Design a protein around this ligand. Structure first.
Ligand SMILES: NC(=O)C1=CN([C@@H]2O[C@H](COP(=O)(O)OP(=O)(O)OC[C@H]3O[C@@H](n4cnc5c(N)ncnc54)[C@H](OP(=O)(O)O)[C@@H]3O)[C@@H](O)[C@H]2O)C=CC1
Ligand SMILES: COc1cc(-c2ccccc2)ccc1[C@@H](C)C#Cc1c(C)nc(N)nc1N
Length: 192
C-alpha cells in the first residue's frame, strides 16, 4: 500500500479532549464501542478489509483473548519492533508507512490509539480524516483524566453530517446519545 489516506478514530471528552486515565479509558459507552467496531470493520467493496493501527500500550490494554480485533488487519507500533508479519491479522512495525508497504487488499486505514500515537500522527499529512466522537458531561473536571489529545483543530474543518453519513455508509448515526451522565455525537473532520 503506497501513501494510503488514513483516518484517526477516537472518542474524547470536551472541552479538554481527555481520552484516558492511568492506561485505561475513563468511560464505557456501549453504543460508542459498537460504532467503533462497525466503522473500522465495514468495507465498501467485497474481498477487502481495513487496517487498524495502534501503539504498543493500547494493544496491551486489549485483553489478550480479545486481540487481534476481529475482521481487521491489526498493526502494532513499537520503537523496539523490527518489521515482522506475525500472522495474517497481525503486523509489527515502527512506522505506519513501512507497516503498510507489503500490505495489499486493504481498503481503509484507521489509527485507533493511543494518546502518544494520536499526538504524533495528527501532524502526519497521510492523515486526511478525523472521526472524533465528541463526548460531553455536566461536570467534566470530575472525571479522572491524565491523558489528552493535542489536536490543532484550527487547521481542520468539521464536516456536515451528510459527509459523515457518506463515510460510514448505512451505519445508523443517532444524535445526542446518552449513557449515564455522558452525552455524545459522531463527527468527521478534514484538513483545510
Ligand atoms: N478514548 C479513546 O478513543 C482511546 C483512548 N485510548 C487511551 O490512550 C491511552 C494509551 O495511550 P498511550 O499511553 O499514549 O500509549 P499508545 O497506545 O499511544 O502507545 C505508545 C507506544 O507506542 C509506540 N510508539 C509511539 N510512537 C512511536 C513511533 N513514532 N514509532 C514507533 N513506535 C511508537 C511506543 O512503544 P514502545 O514503548 O514499545 O516503543 C510507545 O510507548 C490509554 O489510556 C487508552 O485507554 C486509546 C485508544 C482510544
Ligand atoms: C485498548 O482499548 C481497547 C480495548 C478494546 C476491548 C476489546 C474487547 C474487550 C475489551 C476491550 C477495544 C478497543 C480498544 C481501543 C483500541 C479503542 C477504541 C476506540 C473506541 C472505543 N472508540 C473510538 N471512537 N475510537 C477508538 N479508537
Amino acid at each position: 500500500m503506497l501513501k494510503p489516506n488514513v483516518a484517526i478514530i477516537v472518542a474524547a471528552l470536551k472541552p479538554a479532549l481527555g481520552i484516558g486515565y492511568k492506561g485505561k479509558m475513563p468511560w464505557r459507552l456501549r453504543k460508542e464501542i459498537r460504532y467503533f467496531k462497525d466503522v473500522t470493520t465495514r468495507t465498501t467493496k467485497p474481498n477487502t478489509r481495513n487496517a487498524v493501527i495502534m501503539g504498543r500500550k493500547t494493544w496491551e490494554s486489549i485483553p489478550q483473548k480479545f486481540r487481534p480485533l476481529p475482521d481487521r488487519l491489526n498493526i502494532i507500533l513499537s520503537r523496539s519492533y523490527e518489521n515482522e508479519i506475525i500472522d495474517d491479522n497481525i503486523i509489527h512495525a515502527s512506522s505506519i508507512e513501512s507497516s503498510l508497504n507489503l500490505v495489499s487488499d486493504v481498503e481503509r486505514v484507521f489509527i485507533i490509539g493511543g494518546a502518544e500515537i494520536y499526538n504524533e500522527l495528527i501532524n502526519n499529512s497521510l492523515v486526511s480524516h478525523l472521526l472524533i466522537t465528541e463526548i460531553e458531561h455536566p461536570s467534566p473536571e470530575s472525571i479522572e483524566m491524565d491523558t489528552f489529545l493535542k489536536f490543532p483543530l484550527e487547521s481542520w474543518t468539521k464536516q456536515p453530517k451528510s459527509e459523515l453519513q457518506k463515510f460510514v455508509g448505512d451505519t445508523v448515526l443517532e444524535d445526542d446519545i446518552k449513557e449515564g451522565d455522558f452525552t455524545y455525537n459522531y463527527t468527521l473532520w478534514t484538513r483545510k
